[PDB]
Design a protein around this ligand. Structure first.
Ligand SMILES: Nc1ncnc2c1ncn2[C@@H]1O[C@H](COP(=O)(O)OP(=O)(O)CP(=O)(O)O)[C@@H](O)[C@H]1O
Ligand SMILES: [Mg+2]
Lengths: 226, 307
């Protein structure tokens, strides 16, 4: 099975998965000065059901189709007709040691790539929301655990707004290059950070349980108290 | 009360019924909420669809629904097949609980994506972003081929492949549904209808129509008709032709015409599926592979060629 890692899965809730993966690898590699072979495995947009191996090679991101076949009872994965594996893992593992022979030349995949855009499609994430604008949304939700994550004007920084003990409370998150810091705490990306506190307590044992948005209000939201 | 199944049986009270989603002569599907479908998540509510018999259902219909439920357990999970979630078989009405397809059946999906026409515009000018492209249409045919291919590898014939039986999910994934007429032919390699009854004639192959002979070959015929349905964006097969005359038309080598705005290869694909010699029609493995190539070629998205 796949447990995140280079495995990003669905990108953009099924929308513009290739494009989203190109900007995710470009700006990431250009900055971090990534070596050739940097990659991620995403769901295929063109061939529904199959996968795609997207990677960085000479200032350019290229995609490779990962065929899948579930006929022999056991799933099968391959990039070529002469080599097959029982899992994406054994397949990715393999092409890390052994190169990729194509028309141009060969290439061994080097290092994974984190999910830096994963939050841009999530329900709780907002790109342009004022604090009051956010407080007003959480004001219409008379509960504890409801939350959201807005991006602030200040470069590389996001706030986490939530309802603790029946009262609005906010939290500061700061982007440090390619890692997110929640005060002293450090994570790989917003989605890895929210994922964590969706289980663990974020404040007084208050955990992020109820993402909030327009439709989320159509399910809970009334008119706002104060 | 019939053989319960601890594997699928779900407490009848952990299911909250909602509004209708579609009906027929004797059968109905209704939206519902399933509490704690997964044992590790006893309080997580999952939107689902529940299939059940109508008020005027007969003994016969019940056995058909039992069968339908058994078929889905024997076929297994697949990306393009609606997956079975569970059932309520004891002390009350039989409920077959299945995955919920938020965009309905393919026929409806396609029609709601049809153009306005020249000099005409839509009101209230609905989502212009969901208007399907030629790439999206091939992708739908491909997905259904992949699901049928898997079904054939499981030695099963659907016998009721039609756009009304292909469901579309939230992210636009095709899900083959309605296995009430499906049959297992693991060793025999064919099914011969003994009794009589209701049948989707406009989708049935000659031999299944006159000789009552069903195989993967007749499913492929139905798939030819499905293709026509897709490329006409929800048209009706053999429009205006009375069923009683359909018999005469088929016996004389009549095939439907090419849907406007449809390459010749895709029309040729339909023709192959409608071949008079069953053994000459493509199998689903050939349809997936052909459709694979067309999808790769229609979507001008370049990939690494490793050969
Ligand atoms: N999971 C689902 N999600 C959304 N809609 C569904 C659905 N399952 C069925 N429907 C709706 O109900 C319709 C009929 O469902 P289905 O084909 O399973 O029953 P059926 O056609 O066998 C009834 P009958 O046996 O009386 O002819 C579908 O075409 C669709 O409109
Ligand atoms: Mg039906």
């Amino acid at each position: 099975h796949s447990s995140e890692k280079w495995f990003h899965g669905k990108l953009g809730a099924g929308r513009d998965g290739r494009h989203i993966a190109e900007r995710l690898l470009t700006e990431y590699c250009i900055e971090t000065g990534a070596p050739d072979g940097s990659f991620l495995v995403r769901e295929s947009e063109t061939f529904v059901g199959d996968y795609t191996l997207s990677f960085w090679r000479n200032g350019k991101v290229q995609h490779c189709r990962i065929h899948s076949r579930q006929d022999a009872g056991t799933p099968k994965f391959f990039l070529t007709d002469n080599l097959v594996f029982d899992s994406l893992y054994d397949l990715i593992t393999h092409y890390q040691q052994v190169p990729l022979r194509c028309n141009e030349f060969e290439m061994r995949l080097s290092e994974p790539v984190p999910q830096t855009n994963a939050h841009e499609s999530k329900e709780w994430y907002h790109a342009s929301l004022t604090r009051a604008q956010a407080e007003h949304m959480l004001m219409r939700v008379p509960r504890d655990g409801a939350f959201l994550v807005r991006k602030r004007n200040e470069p590389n920084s996001y706030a986490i707004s939530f309802r603790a003990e029946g009262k609005i409370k906010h939290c500061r998150v700061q982007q440090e290059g390619q890692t997110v810091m929640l005060g002293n705490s450090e994570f790989d990306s917003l989605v890895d950070l929210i994922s964590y506190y969706e289980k663990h307590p974020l404040y007084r044992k208050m955990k992020l349980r109820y993402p909030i948005n327009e439709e989320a209000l159509e399910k809970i939201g009334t008119a706002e108290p104060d | 009360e019939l053989p319960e199944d601890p594997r699928w049986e779900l407490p009848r009270d952990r299911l909250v019924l909602g509004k209708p989603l579609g009906e027929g002569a004797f059968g109905q599907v209704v939206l519902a909420e399933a509490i704690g479908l997964d044992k590790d998540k006893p309080n997580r509510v999952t939107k689902v669809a529940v299939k059940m018999l109508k008020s005027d259902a007969t003994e016969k219909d019940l056995s058909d629904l039992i069968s339908e439920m058994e078929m889905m357990k024997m076929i297994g999970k697949h990306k393009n097949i609606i997956n079975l979630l569970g059932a309520c078989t004891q002390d009350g009405p039989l409920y077959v609980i299945v995955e919920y397809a938020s965009k309905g059946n393919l026929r409806e999906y396609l029609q709601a994506r049809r153009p306005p026409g020249l000099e005409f515009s839509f009101n209230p000018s609905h989502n212009p972003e969901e208007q399907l492209s030629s790439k999206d249409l091939v992708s739908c045919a491909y997905q259904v081929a992949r699901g049928m291919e898997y079904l054939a590898s499981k030695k099963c014939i659907h016998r009721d492949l039609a756009a009304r039986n292909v469901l579309v999910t939230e992210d636009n994934v095709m899900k083959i549904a309605d296995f009430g007429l499906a049959r297992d032919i693991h060793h025999i390699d064919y099914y011969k209808k003994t009794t009589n009854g209701r049948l989707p004639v406009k989708w049935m192959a000659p031999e299944a129509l006159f000789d009552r002979i069903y195989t993967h070959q007749s499913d492929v015929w139905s798939f030819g008709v499905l293709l026509w349905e897709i490329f006409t964006l929800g048209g009706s097969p053999y429009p205006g032709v009375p069923v009683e005359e359909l018999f005469k038309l088929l016996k004389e080598g009549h095939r439907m015409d090419k849907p406007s705005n449809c390459t010749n290869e895709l029309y040729m694909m339909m023709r192959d599926c409608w071949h008079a010699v069953p053994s000459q029609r493509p199998t689903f493995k050939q349809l997936v592979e052909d459709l694979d190539r067309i999808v790769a070629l229609t979507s001008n998205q370049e990939y690494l060629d490793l050969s």
